[PDB]
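User: Predict probable nitrite reductase [nad(p)h] small subunit nird's structure from this.
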Amino acid sequence: DIQVWTTACAYDHLIPGRGVGVLLDDGSQVALFRLDDGSVHAVGNVDPFSGAAVMSRGIVGDRGGRAMVQSPILKQAFALDDGSCLDDPRVSVPVYPARVTPEGRIQVARVAV
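Assistant:
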């Protein structure tokens, strides 16, 4: 595995709970969120039911303490940690490594060979 990092933005430019769409080096589309605990999480931007590129516009919440985003129309919950649909175990979005560098830059990786 190699991680190919795309720099999203300055940490202090992302408001907690307000997702943003990020384009990775290979064209993958990502929904990026910062949470109240300071963490950043990147999941697939495409709703896996409708194909709508709108996940970044979803509402961040909790399900039994577990951080999630609800898709905008269909209102289905996806865990931010592993991209699993919490409402339908057979469905998921991809999850992408996401970090904040010591200097305060948010990056998102895709994994390549």
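The chain has no helices and ten strands.
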